[PDB]
């Protein structure tokens, strides 16, 4: 149904709103019937979920019918279809967690090849496209490559990932040096 995107090692808020603006009974679980967290009595409980530590909600917003799921330090394999269950509601949200790295270590050289790689989760259709500090645009799949680097490229690169109609945007600093051999 609803589809949220998120960056690696980042934070995201999955929303789940039921009617009767009040602290009623609820819980979150993933696609594999594993309780992420829920309210037992009035107190927040955390389940056997792999996310046990990095998962939390927001208590004050419970009296407003809101029951948000909050996940910090997002890893990629956290990508999944999360299910919130309230009263007789089944509100589903698919989280997809992308990441972006420069597989060329760092400190590159005029003429060398640069490659940005998109760490995507299993079973995704990402369409990336970036923008150098000049204006030129490159686009591709998991692998976007710059054949041969310039000095004008030394700066901050912006990159747009598009999943479905939603999108996330990374920025990644790259430095380029010059060299000669006489």
């Amino acid at each position, epitope marked *: 149904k609803k589809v949220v995107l998120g960056k690696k090692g980042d934070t995201v808020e999955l929303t789940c709103t039921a009617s009767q603006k009040k602290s009623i009974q609820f819980h979150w679980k993933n*696609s594999n019937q594993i*309780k992420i967290l829920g309210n037992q009595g009035s107190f927040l409980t955390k*389940g*056997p979920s*792999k996310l*046990n530590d990095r998962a939390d909600s927001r208590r004050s917003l419970w009296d407003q019918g809101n029951f948000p799921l909050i996940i910090k330090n997002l890893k990629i394999e956290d990508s999944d279809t999360y299910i919130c269950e309230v009263e007789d509601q089944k509100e589903e949200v698919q989280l997809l967690v992308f990441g972006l790295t420069a597989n060329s270590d760092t400190h590159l050289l005029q003429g060398q090849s640069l490659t940005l790689t998109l760490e995507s989760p299993p079973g995704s259709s990402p369409s990336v496209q970036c923008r150098s500090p000049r204006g030129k645009n490159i686009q591709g799949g998991k692998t976007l490559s710059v054949s041969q680097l310039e000095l004008q490229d030394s700066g901050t690169w912006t990159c747009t990932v598009l999943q479905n109609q939603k999108k996330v945007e990374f920025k990644i600093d790259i430095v380029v040096l010059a060299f000669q051999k006489a």
Partner: antibody
Amino acid sequence: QVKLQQSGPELKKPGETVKISCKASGYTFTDYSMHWVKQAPGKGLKWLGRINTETGEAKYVDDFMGHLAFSLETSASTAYLQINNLKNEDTATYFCARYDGYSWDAMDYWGQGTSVIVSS
Amino acid sequence: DIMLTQSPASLTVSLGQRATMSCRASQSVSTSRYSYMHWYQEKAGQPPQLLIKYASNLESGVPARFSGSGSGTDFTLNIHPVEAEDTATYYCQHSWEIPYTFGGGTKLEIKR
């Protein structure tokens, strides 16, 4: 106190099919994934596959296509494991078991253990 | 891929002595708070039975002489003092990521 009840032991020739059943009585069948484990004679345990008792979806690690087909009958709280192209390797003891997704128990309840014997 | 390697493959110990069995995971199966590991006991021709759940918690009934410990990639059970009925094969299982694989097992025998 729940409990998992499987089918009796089975004798099949090589190349035949066998369908062993597992029924849960004590909890709500569709609120817990069901896992299957194989233990060949004289060997140790080995995980086989989990089936989602809500969606029907199951993931398993069997060599060769087919041969391992997990299915459900929610209408009678019963999970099935079907082995299609039997072999002398398949001769083993098979267990189904629940995995507590709600609480900090684990494979908390197992099955009696079905004994498939494949030989001519 | 998550491989569990148990050592030793077999253990021989006299009554009243301490039995130590290790289980090493290829990758971490824990998250600060908890560790997703389990120990089973399977006596001669018996079904396996859960002994320790989540690395350090004794199952109901299990005698106090059993204990589990460890975190991350290294885990240990202890049986002290060993008794006659402890003759059995012991396995270890992780519930980190499907497949919930098993260790190779360790057979414990008593020296009289």
